[PDB]
Amino acid sequence: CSVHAECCRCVANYTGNGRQCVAEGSPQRVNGKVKGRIFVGSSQVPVVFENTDLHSYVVMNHGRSYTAISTIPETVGYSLLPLAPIGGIIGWMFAVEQDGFKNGFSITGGEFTRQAEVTFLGHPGKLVLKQQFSGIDEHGHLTISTELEGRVPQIPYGASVHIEPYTELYHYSSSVITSSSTREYTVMEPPSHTHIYQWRQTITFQECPALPSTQQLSVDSVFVLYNKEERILRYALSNSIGPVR
Known part of the structure; x- marks a missing residue:
C-alpha cells in the first residue's frame, strides 16, 4: 500500500489506486527508454535506435501531457509525426475526470502493460507498440518503457503534420481495457495530403461498484x-474522460 493510502485506497487530497497515489492537482513526470526498429516507406533497411530518452510532463488543469523523445534520427523523425498515441497513453492516464468516470491512473496506479497496433490504409505492413508502466520510482517519477517495431509510410523531410480533435471509446472488462479507432491526419510539404490509419489497443493491469463498461476519451489541442x-x-x-453524449 502507498504511504498516502489506507488499508488499499488513497486518502482525501490524493488520487490513484491503492499501491500508487499522487497529490491532487500537482504536475507529474513520466520518464523512460525507447527502443526502435522502423522500416520507412518501401525500404528494406530498418532504422535502429536504442537507449533513447522519453520525458513526459503533465499539467493537471486540462489533462494536458507533453511528451519529448530525444535523439531521434532525421531518418525517422518526420515519419513518426502522426504517431501521437505513443505519448497519448499518458494523456489517458491523467485525463480530467467527469462525475462518475475515472482516468487511467485512478484505475491502474501507473502499473500496467499496453500493446498497440497501427495500420496505415493503402500502405503495406503495420507498426506494433509495446509499453510497460511500473509505478513511481525512487525519484518520485512515474515510469514507462517503450518498444516500437514495424513499418510506416514515408513522410518528406521538413514536412509538417496536423491532427484535429477526436474521441475514443475505451471498453472495460475483467481487468482488461481495449480500444479500436480509425482516424485521419494531414501532411503538409515544406500543398496538403490527408491520410488515415487504424489503431487497436489492449491495456492489462491488476485490481484488488464495478467500473463503467465503456468510457469516452475526448482529445483536443493536439500538436506533434x-x-x-x-x-x-x-x-x-x-x-x-467521461460518457458518450
Whole structure:
C-alpha cells in the first residue's frame, strides 16, 4: 500500500489506486527508454535506435501531457509525426475526470502493460507498440518503457503534420481495457495530403461498484513536432474522460 493510502485506497487530497497515489492537482513526470526498429516507406533497411530518452510532463488543469523523445534520427523523425498515441497513453492516464468516470491512473496506479497496433490504409505492413508502466520510482517519477517495431509510410523531410480533435471509446472488462479507432491526419510539404490509419489497443493491469463498461476519451489541442536541429520528437495533447453524449 502507498504511504498516502489506507488499508488499499488513497486518502482525501490524493488520487490513484491503492499501491500508487499522487497529490491532487500537482504536475507529474513520466520518464523512460525507447527502443526502435522502423522500416520507412518501401525500404528494406530498418532504422535502429536504442537507449533513447522519453520525458513526459503533465499539467493537471486540462489533462494536458507533453511528451519529448530525444535523439531521434532525421531518418525517422518526420515519419513518426502522426504517431501521437505513443505519448497519448499518458494523456489517458491523467485525463480530467467527469462525475462518475475515472482516468487511467485512478484505475491502474501507473502499473500496467499496453500493446498497440497501427495500420496505415493503402500502405503495406503495420507498426506494433509495446509499453510497460511500473509505478513511481525512487525519484518520485512515474515510469514507462517503450518498444516500437514495424513499418510506416514515408513522410518528406521538413514536412509538417496536423491532427484535429477526436474521441475514443475505451471498453472495460475483467481487468482488461481495449480500444479500436480509425482516424485521419494531414501532411503538409515544406500543398496538403490527408491520410488515415487504424489503431487497436489492449491495456492489462491488476485490481484488488464495478467500473463503467465503456468510457469516452475526448482529445483536443493536439500538436506533434520534429526538429531536425535538436533531433527531438514531441507530442502534446489535452484530455477528458467521461460518457458518450
